[PDB]
Amino acid sequence: TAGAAAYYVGYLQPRTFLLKYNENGTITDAVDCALDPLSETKCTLKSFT
Amino acid sequence: QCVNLTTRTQLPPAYTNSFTRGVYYPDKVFRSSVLHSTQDLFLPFFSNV
Amino acid sequence: TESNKKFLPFQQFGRDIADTTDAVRDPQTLEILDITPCSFGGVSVITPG
Ligand SMILES: *[C@@H]1O[C@H](CO)[C@@H](O)[C@H](O)[C@H]1NC(C)=O
């Protein structure tokens, strides 16, 4: 017997993201280009606003 | 010495919305570069995990 | 020159916008070195006829 436990699983896909590096070299924010029209617009301009 | 005790009755798995998870680092340092497009295998945001 | 950049344990180099290398870490000593270009500029000759 092994008591109780749980875990989550997801499967990866080939995507192109846009990453924001903090002043301390940390990936604080990311944008996925194929999620929705707004995100793809953000990717095309190469800006988060 | 393994012993056979496993049970395999069906169970309806649960789902959830994986959001902003599954982004990892590059090899080198990018400093304060607000953007850097990168194409790779990731976990799309707001997916059924 | 000596520099204060928070390099991760697996991070070695630091890249500029134009792909040029800027910051490195000496293999012998883990101190972070910042590379800068040697001074240069234009020369303009003011001449009467
Ligand atoms: C980098 O780390 C220092 C450590 O004190 C912190 O004060 C600073 O705010 C960090 N930089 C950013 C942009 O958060």
Residue C15 makes CB contacts below 8 A (sequence gap 6+) with: B28, B29, B30, C21, C22
Resolution (A): 3.2
CA distance A25 to C12: 12
Gap from CA of A13 to ligand 1 centroid (Å): 33
Residues belonging to chain C: 49
Looking from the CA of A18 toward its CB, the CA atoms found within 13 Å total: 19
Distance CA C29, CA B2 (A): 50
**Ligand 1 atom with least separation from CA of A22:** 13
Q: CB B29: neighbour CB atoms within 10 A? A: 23
Q: Which residues of A17-43 are buried (b: 16+ CB within 10 A; e: fewer)?
A: bbbbbeeebebeebbbbebeeebeebb
Q: Where are the alpha helices (DSSP H) in chain B?
A: none
Q: Which residue has the tokens 């993201």?
A: A17
Residue of the nearest CA to atom 8 in ligand 1? A24
Tell me the C-alpha to C-alpha distance, in Å, between residue C11 and each of B28, B32, C19, C29: 5, 15, 16, 14
Q: Nearest-CA residue of chain C relative to B31? A: C14
Q: What is the DSSP secondary structure assignment for residue A14, as one 8-state letter?
A: E
The rounded distance, in Å, linking the Cα atoms of A48 and B8 is: 48
**Is the CB of B25 less than 8 angstroms away from the CB of A35?**
no
Q: What are phi and psi of B29, to 5 degrees?
A: -95, 125
Method for this entry: cryo-EM
How far is B44 from B21, CA to CA, in rounded Å?
Answer: 8
Tell me whether residues C14 and B33 touch, CB distance under 8 A. Answer: no
